[PDB]
Symmetry: D2
Subunit: 115 residues, 4 copies
């Protein structure tokens, strides 16, 4: 159920392939200037008790056209079914000097759907 | 640089290779939790950091499943590498477990890790 | 604005009083055994540009009937408007031995509405 | 054991009184320009098995001299002993417009000592 195209509410889009041995590979877009490589991992043998599938992935926001000197990680779970969704929490860290490290990391949450 | 063997404050080991293309590949062995042996890791880093003394942003994921066991969970580390006298990588991390919908509210642990090239 | 009775996504009720110089006082429930004291602070002089009102509160999960040996803090902002809402992120810390400190804190998010 | 003056390792000072009712009251200094009111809660009946004591507190960064339109919540635990410490994770939320509301919260950590 994970392989495919996913959308959040802010428009953004991500296309992933969930390989056989837990790999997650794909791209994240918000045009070419807006596409970034993603890579992650997921639990390739989840429970069957009704639990979701744990996964995670990272995007460093540099492509051949841009560099924000930052990286986001999303940690969450795939919830299959008719309203399949991926519920995540994320951390965005920015390259900062030591003096400003205390405010280098933003936290938030995102839900992705197939629609 | 980032490539090498790193240790966190708890004795966990992170062996990583920083590719040319912003890719991070390696292995992680955790000292704590529902873990055993090495786990595959993958991530990304900024391969063209700023000059001003800023650190290098990076992140990576481990799904806690190998041939020995499966914890049904995954951890993502988000942070930055700071080179120099004592090189170090400072991170914040999110550990998400597979749960049913009713317990999704308690599925995610949050913490911070410091990695260094010398074992503590 | 902030003063009154609020509800989250899950059926918990939060009754607050917002005081003239930034105190937040009240109770958090989910009967009496599920009733706990909260306290916090808010920006008593927000921006007039459209931004929300920053706030936070804490609940320790001890009352006369129960003690879970833990505390939750909510960090967020009130938004006045169509549906007045409080959007938050929370941290729940459990008292642990230092061997288990790594697993002591959960993170999540909640949205409160007067409905 | 919590009542007292506490220092983090970046020049900040927390003076707190822990009340018999589970209340935390005090001052956070980062000068009188730099003094802010804090309020929180803690477990007034913790375990005596070596587990720490859960607590939290909030500072809204408004005083009579300045206003950052922001608030920090600290979630953590007190650990007694020779080298007593309070280990925390915090959330700093800023007042933002609706569209910037995703970049509104910073996450970090703090350790305080009686030094």
């Amino acid at each position: 159920g994970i392989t495919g195209t996913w959308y959040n509410q802010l428009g953004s889009t991500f296309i992933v392939t969930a390989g056989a041995d837990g790999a997650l590979t794909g791209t994240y877009e918000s045009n070419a200037e807006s596409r970034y490589v993603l890579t992650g991992r997921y639990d390739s043998a989840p429970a069957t008790d009704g639990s979701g599938t744990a996964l995670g992935w990272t995007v460093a926001w540099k492509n051949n056209y841009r560099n924000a000197h930052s990286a986001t990680t999303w940690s969450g779970q795939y919830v299959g079914g008719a309203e399949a969704r991926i519920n995540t929490q994320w951390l965005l860290t920015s390259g900062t000097t030591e003096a400003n490290a205390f405010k280098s990391t933003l936290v938030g949450h995102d839900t992705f759907t197939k629609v």
